[PDB]
């Protein structure tokens, strides 16, 4: 209906730069600094490996059939050749996991031989880790006194080598493997070697890692289905062992030729061969179990630090499973939870059965009709299922380590990257989880992939990573990763939201990082960016990128000048979006740093001038940035600016104006910046300069993913309003109930000056002459809040208005000097934040708010009416009034956007249509005394007719300006000294106040509806400023206040 004029859908000042309770982020405050946890720089290497092998062949030790070792029958070759070959095999078996490390073998040794072995390994691999592999199968079991058994020369005795002396020979960075019976006994000895303390875990201290085959009481298996070398052959030859175990147990065994496992085609590297793909799946399966089972710190040490420890501890989870089946329970020193029977070995068992059945026919002919296992595809689907349902901080997604494994092969690279990005998007926690798995270096190497299929996803992944951790700068620049995103800025690949991310990724790459600046400078990032300057987030981030590039880097600054950067940036200072403008100010701001002119003085004068044009900006966000650029400039020109400040107390006098202007700004955070800039000049070493915040605030956009009750309370109020509009109109309004429903003591010593009834709640707002703001409830007879609108000494209240009545009202408070302050949560007991503050008019300021258009009209004792668009926070228009005397009163129409009424000091009246090339519509006298118009308003209706024109002379004059100049109707409110007027929004009713104590309500046709007399509380006889008369918007409730100290409320029974 037409009553959609009465209900404006325009919301204003409810954007992220106007943020509320927890976040003082909006601006002023610096960005939230982080402290990372995933950081262990030391990529450790196992440099030396000592294989000690204690087996007399056909001489069992007296603690006693199966006897295979390193996949050799030691009886088949005779003792000395057998023991050589097993030494050679076991070496190459280990060597496949760590090919760049030295391997030294020791067969049936003396204690003296082991001493030199260990001393030599430690001397070879100084800080690097040393591996000790012991095999005590042909010697007695380790003691409870902490002993290993070796030989003497002649092989007549078993000689006890104590663990103490081993651990003296090898030191700190070392790792042990004990493939013997009763192997725990060694680990218990190790635990007691050193003094307890030196840690905050179960029982640790050094960097001594220990893998052992079985428990204290336990003995290694004896059945022929296992070898003797079970633990070793799990740890060192996992696939061969896993399958051979699988045949002999699960499928029952006699169907499948077991020796096909030895003849599996391909090599362990090729993921496209059947062997290497089975080895891939194993790593993927094993690594996944470890990640879901262990905590961040322990997993990273064992599974991410050393290529060989990662292999050994991966392959240890197979031992955890197999040994178990043969009455053995192995233990590592960093102990790790139970790993067998995890829902994931199930997936291995499946993949191995599908492999082993296939193997029979691939041997019949090398057909290479090897179907890649579904495993990977199957698991990425279970990651998608997780990403929909339960996708919270509701325990990790489990498939995550497998998503990493897929990034390593083109086979399913795009969907993996897509799903990873989908996962990173849900928050910082998910970025923290991904980086913990170890996604960083793989995603970093993918910045050499030319495939355009990827890049759009890769920019997004990197956006999310760099939104969390800024420090990846160093790694990105070192690999030339910066070029990947510069390409993306200059690409033909569409979508400018992707390009903003590119510009953000580069801005972070550059941020306080001269290696990155210089790299991007050579890569022509000034040219790339400035090419695009001819969407708002993209513009915002081009400036932030450019600004960060030249910041404190004079080569780039020179390049920016001689690429006319000022000429391209400056036009963004007019843009409607505050975010853009503020970013534009930043960019020009960071370009900075008698009678002489060289190149730069032409630029830096032209820059600072263009910044000073935006000192008066409506957004504090902008003003903050302008003050920082002024601070920077002020640093460089202290010589000149002090001399300019001497005479004030070419361009420098303009700066001093702006500094003192900033110091008296309504937003106190801006004010304090102005006070800072002043103090840099010496009015009352770089570290004193304030720092820009526009970059830090904007970055939060990316660390944030890329509802219904919003409409609920909207329609609540609209239904209430539409109904009460019709009732206001259609009910035949009776006389005033002179018995007031409240007579509230403000405790304003001088009295109440302006007041405001709330539409959708039972609330009053009142204002002192010093701009204290109270929020009185009339239905509870209580105070909801108390304020001080600003601490400045020169006070003065002009106006109170609600902004966004239909959805969480903000309280506008206009001051007589033209300052405007808008407060959220003004009804709360003392949690009431200043949302925005700016100086309209650039006195006796008068103001009015038009929700329909988003326009704030402001003027006073000035030639002009000033127009503010609060969606933009800009000074949209300066309309000359064409009066040559002051605007005393000012009413914007609720219905018709743009259209404005204005009363004047000489009693005159003017319409404006502020959206017209010539704004003044008509100019009329009506009432003819030559006294100021104390109040006016458009009539309650849907036309441009006008109650208007209460003159201070006392006559209220009605006029319909479509048809005639002279008056509809005159009503004589008061013989002189009319001090206020109130015109209802919808109901056909008005009211007027006198300095002679008196208040008179009238009908719109002119009838008297009720006299009231505000009596004085003592005999000052000064009820002479009956200033606040105001109606409830949707009800017939009056509210009256005066030069005494009471706010009385009335109604019509």
């Amino acid at each position: 209906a037409t009553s959609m004029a009465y209900l404006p859908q325009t919301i204003v000042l409810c954007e992220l730069r106007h943020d509320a309770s927890e976040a003082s982020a909006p601006l002023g405050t610096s960005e939230i600094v982080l402290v990372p946890k995933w950081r262990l720089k030391e990529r450790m290497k196992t440099g030396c490996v000592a294989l000690v092998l204690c087996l007399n062949i056909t001489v069992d030790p007296p603690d006693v059939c199966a006897r295979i070792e390193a996949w050799i029958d030691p009886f088949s070759m005779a003792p000395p050749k057998a023991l050589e070959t097993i030494g050679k095999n076991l070496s190459t078996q280990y060597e496949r996991w760590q090919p760049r490390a030295r391997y030294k073998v020791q067969l049936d040794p003396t204690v003296d031989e082991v001493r030199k072995l260990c001393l030599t390994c430690r001397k070879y691999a100084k800080t690097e880790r040393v591996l000790f592999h012991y095999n005590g199968h042909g010697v007695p079991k380790p003691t409870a006194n902490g002993e290993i058994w070796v030989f003497n020369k002649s092989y007549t005795q078993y000689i006890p080598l104590p663990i103490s002396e081993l651990d003296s020979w090898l030191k700190t960075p070392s790792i042990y493997v004990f493939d013997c019976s009763a192997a725990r006994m060694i680990l218990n000895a190790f635990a007691e070697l050193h003094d307890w303390g030196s840690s905050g875990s179960s029982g640790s201290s050094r960097d001594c890692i220990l893998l052992a085959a079985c428990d204290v009481h336990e003995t290694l298996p004896q059945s022929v289905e296992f070898p003797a070398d079970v633990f070793t052959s799990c740890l060192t030859t996992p696939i061969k062992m896993a399958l051979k175990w699988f045949c002999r147990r699960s499928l029952l065994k006699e169907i499948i030729d077991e020796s096909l496992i030895d003849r599996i085609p391909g090599r362990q590297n090729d993921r496209k061969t059947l062997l290497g793909e089975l080895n891939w799946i194993f790593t993927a399966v094993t690594d996944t179990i470890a990640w879901n089972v262990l905590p961040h710190e322990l997993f990273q040490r064992l599974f991410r630090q050393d290529l060989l420890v990662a292999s050994l501890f991966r392959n240890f989870l197979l031992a955890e499973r197999i040994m178990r089946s043969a009455n053995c329970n192995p233990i590592s020193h960093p102990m790790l939870p139970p790993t067998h029977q995890h829902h994931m070995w199930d997936a291995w068992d499946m993949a191995a059965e599908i492999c082993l059945s296939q193997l029979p026919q691939l041997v019949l002919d090398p057909s290479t009709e090897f179907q890649p296992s579904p495993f990977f595809t199957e698991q990425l689907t279970a990651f998608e299922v997780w990403l929909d349902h339960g996708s919270e901080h509701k325990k990790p997604p489990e498939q995550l380590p497998i998503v990493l494994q897929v990034l390593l092969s083109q086979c399913h690279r795009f969907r993996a990257l897509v799903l990873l990005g989908r996962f990173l998007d849900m928050g910082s926690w998910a970025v923290d989880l991904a980086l913990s798995v170890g996604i960083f270096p793989y995603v970093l190497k993918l910045l050499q992939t030319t495939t355009n299929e990827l890049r759009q996803i890769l920019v997004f992944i990197w956006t999310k990573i760099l939104a969390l951790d800024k420090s990846c700068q160093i790694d990105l620049v070192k690999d030339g990763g910066h070029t990947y995103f510069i390409r993306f800025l200059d690409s033909s690949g569409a979508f400018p939201e992707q390009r903003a991310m590119a510009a953000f990724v580069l801005a972070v790459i550059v941020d306080g990082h001269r290696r990155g600046q210089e790299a991007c400078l050579e890569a022509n990032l000034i040219g790339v960016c400035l090419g695009h300057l001819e969407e708002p987030l993209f513009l915002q981030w081009l400036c932030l990128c450019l600004g960060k590039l030249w910041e404190d880097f004079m080569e780039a600054q020179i390049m920016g000048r001689e690429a006319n950067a000022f000429e391209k940036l400056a036009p963004l200072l007019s843009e409607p979006q505050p975010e853009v403008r503020a970013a534009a100010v930043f960019a020009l701001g960071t370009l900075l740093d008698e009678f002489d002119d060289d190149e730069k003085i032409r630029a830096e004068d032209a820059i600072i001038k263009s910044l000073l044009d935006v000192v008066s900006d409506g957004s504090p966000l902008v003003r903050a940035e302008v003050a920082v650029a002024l601070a920077r400039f002020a640093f460089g020109h202290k010589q000149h600016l002090k001399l300019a400040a001497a005479s004030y107390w070419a361009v420098y006098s303009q700066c001093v104006r702006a500094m003192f202007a900033l110091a008296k700004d309504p937003s106190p955070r801006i004010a304090s910046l102005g006070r800072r800039v002043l103090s840099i000049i010496g009015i009352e070493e770089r570290s004193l300069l304030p720092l820009s915040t526009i970059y830090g605030w904007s970055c939060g956009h990316f660390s944030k993913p890329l509802s219904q009750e919003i409409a609920a309370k909207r329609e609540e109020k609209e239904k209430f309003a539409l109904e009460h509009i019709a009732k206001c109109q259609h009910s035949s309004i009776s006389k005033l109930n002179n018995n007031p429903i409240a007579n509230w003591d403000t405790r304003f010593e001088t009295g109440t000056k302006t007041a405001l009834l709330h539409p959708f709640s039972p609330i009053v707002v009142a204002a002192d002459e010093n701009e204290r703001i109270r929020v009185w409830n009339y239905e509870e007879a209580t105070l909801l809040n108390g304020f001080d609108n600003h601490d400045f000494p020169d006070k003065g209240i002009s106006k109170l208005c609600l902004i966004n009545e239909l959805d969480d009202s903000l309280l506008l408070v206009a001051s007589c000097d033209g300052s405007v302050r808008i407060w959220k949560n003004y009804a709360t007991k003392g949690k009431q934040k200043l949302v925005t503050g700016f100086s309209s008019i650039q006195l006796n300021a008068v103001v009015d708010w038009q929700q329909q258009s988003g326009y704030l009209y402001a003027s006073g004792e000035t030639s002009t009416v000033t127009l503010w668009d609060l969606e933009k926070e800009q000074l949209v228009r300066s309309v000359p009034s064409e009066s040559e005397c002051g605007v005393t009163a000012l009413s914007a129409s609720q219905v018709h956007g743009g259209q404005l009424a204005a009363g004047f000091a000489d009693g005159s009246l003017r319409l404006y249509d502020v959206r017209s090339p010539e704004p003044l519509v008509c100019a009329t006298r009506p009432h003819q005394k030559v006294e100021r118009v104390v109040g006016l308003s458009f009539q309650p209706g849907l036309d441009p007719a006008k109650v208007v024109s209460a003159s201070q002379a006392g006559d209220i004059q009605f006029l319909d300006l479509r048809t005639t100049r002279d008056t509809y109707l005159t009503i004589d409110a008061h013989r002189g000294s009319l001090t206020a007027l109130a015109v209802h929004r919808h109901a056909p009713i008005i009211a007027s106040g006198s300095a002679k104590q008196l208040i008179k309500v009238f009908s719109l046709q002119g009838e008297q509806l009720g006299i009231i007399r505000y009596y004085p509380s003592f005999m000052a006889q000064k009820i002479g400023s009956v200033s606040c008369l105001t109606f409830h918007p949707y009800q017939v409730l009056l509210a009256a206040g005066a030069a005494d100290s009471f706010v009385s409320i009335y109604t019509h029974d």
Partner: peptide, 8 residues
């Protein structure tokens, strides 16, 4: 930097 190989 990583434990596992990558194909490109």
């Amino acid at each position: 930097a990583g434990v596992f190989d990558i194909d490109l």
